[PDB]
C-alpha cells in the first residue's frame, strides 16, 4: 500500500502512541526522541541529561485512507496547542508540541492546518512546524507501553480516537 509518515510531538508518547494505534488507516506508530542535540539518546539522556529531544511518535499511515490533514485533525483533538513545554502534568522541552516532516512540501500544508486551528483558540498556538532533524526509536519497553501496561499513565483519553472525523 501507499504509506506516508509524519512525526508528532504531543507530550508523553505513551498516550499519544496508544491513541494513534486505534485509528483505522494508521499502520504503525513508533515512539522516539526527535530534534535533539545528540544522536542515539536513551530515555535517561533525554529526561535527565538535557539532550533537548522531544518525545515524538512516528506515525505511518495508509495514504489511500488518511490524508496528512486527517492525521493533523486527530492530533489537534487530544493535544493542547497553546501550552509551551507542557502537556497535562508533564513539564519540560521533551513534552513540547510539534509536527516534524521529511518532505519540504508538507510545511505549507501543516502551517495552513495550524492557521485554521487557531480560529478555535483565543490563546496563540505554539506548536512547532519544522523539518525532522533527527529521530531515534525509544527503548522496547516504551513501545506499545499502554498495551503492555493497561493501567499505565496517560494524559490522553485514548477512547477519543474512535470519534469519526467531521
UniProtKB/Swiss-Prot annotation:
Source domain of life: Bacteria
Ranges where the record places region Peptide methionine sulfoxide reductase A: 4-159
Key words, A-Z: Disulfide bond, Electron transport, Multifunctional enzyme, Oxidoreductase, Redox-active center, Transport
Active site per UniProt: 12
Zinc-finger found in the keyword field: no
Gene Ontology biological-process entries: cellular response to oxidative stress; protein modification process
GO molecular function: L-methionine-(S)-S-oxide reductase activity; peptide-methionine (R)-S-oxide reductase activity; peptide-methionine (S)-S-oxide reductase activity
Single GO cellular component term: cytoplasm
Function text: Has an important function as a repair enzyme for proteins that have been inactivated by oxidation. Catalyzes the reversible oxidation-reduction of methionine sulfoxide in proteins to methionine.
Note: The domain MsrB is stereospecific for the R isomer of the sulfoxide of MetSO whereas the domain MsrA is stereospecific for the S isomer.
Domain notes for this protein: Possesses 2 methionine sulfoxide reductase domains (A/MsrA and B/MsrB) and 1 N-terminal thioredoxin domain.
Protein family membership: In the N-terminal section; belongs to the thioredoxin family. In the central section; belongs to the MsrA Met sulfoxide reductase family.
Name this polypeptide is given: Peptide methionine sulfoxide reductase MsrA/MsrB
Gene coding for it: msrAB
